[PDB]
């Protein structure tokens, strides 16, 4: 997984 | 001197849903919480009016902020392409939280989320700038058109956000 990122999203 | 106010009005394929108000905690975060502040009322030529909540996720949070591409590969801060993470005194405590999404270490844009849950393993990682002040059950009413991976049921957008106090 429960991630905010912005562009790659992970687990 | 009072830390500054700002509000959305959210709407559902255009039907509004309704205002949310964020107190914004310049008292703590300055540089973060002006970025938010300024692309909240559009003062520099582009902003969050009109942009969509691109990510829901139902228990978790509503992602924001990507006025350039839309996808949550864009957008900008008014400081130039990123910035750096200014500092981690506040924690991701519970619903209502108002934090900066990036991509790793210092690089903050536009991106943000609205906690719906306390989101701890977030800590030190992300920076919090604000809460919600009023108008979290529209925010609850947001979720309900996330899904477990983020896309959105229905397009919820920015129908309109300034600057209160």
Same mark, same amino acid.
């Given at each position: 997984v429960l991630l905010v990122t912005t562009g790659l999203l992970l687990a | 001197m009072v830390n500054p106010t700002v509000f959305f009005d959210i709407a559902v394929d255009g039907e509004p849903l309704g205002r949310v108000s964020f107190e914004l905690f310049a008292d703590k975060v300055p540089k973060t919480a002006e970025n938010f502040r300024a692309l909240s009322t559009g /003062?520099? %030529? #582009?902003?969050?009016? %009109?942009?969509? #909540?691109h990510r829901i996720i139902p228990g978790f949070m509503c992602q924001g902020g990507?006025?350039?591409?839309?996808?949550?590969?864009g957008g900008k801060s008014i400081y130039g392409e990123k910035f750096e993470? /200014?500092?981690?005194?506040?924690?991701?405590?519970?619903?209502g939280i108002l934090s900066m999404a990036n991509a %790793?270490?210092?690089?903050?844009?536009?991106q943000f989320f609205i906690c719906?849950?306390?989101?701890?393993?977030?800590d030190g990682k992300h920076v919090v700038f604000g809460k919600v002040k009023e108008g979290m059950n529209i925010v609850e009413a947001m979720e309900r058109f996330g899904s477990r991976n983020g896309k959105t049921s229905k397009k919820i957008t920015i129908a309109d956000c300034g600057q209160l106090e």
């Open positions: - | /003062e520099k %030529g #582009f902003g969050y009016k %009109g942009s969509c #909540f990507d006025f350039t591409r839309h996808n949550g590969t993470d /200014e500092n981690f005194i506040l924690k991701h405590t519970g619903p %790793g270490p210092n690089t903050n844009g536009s719906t849950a306390k989101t701890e393993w977030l």
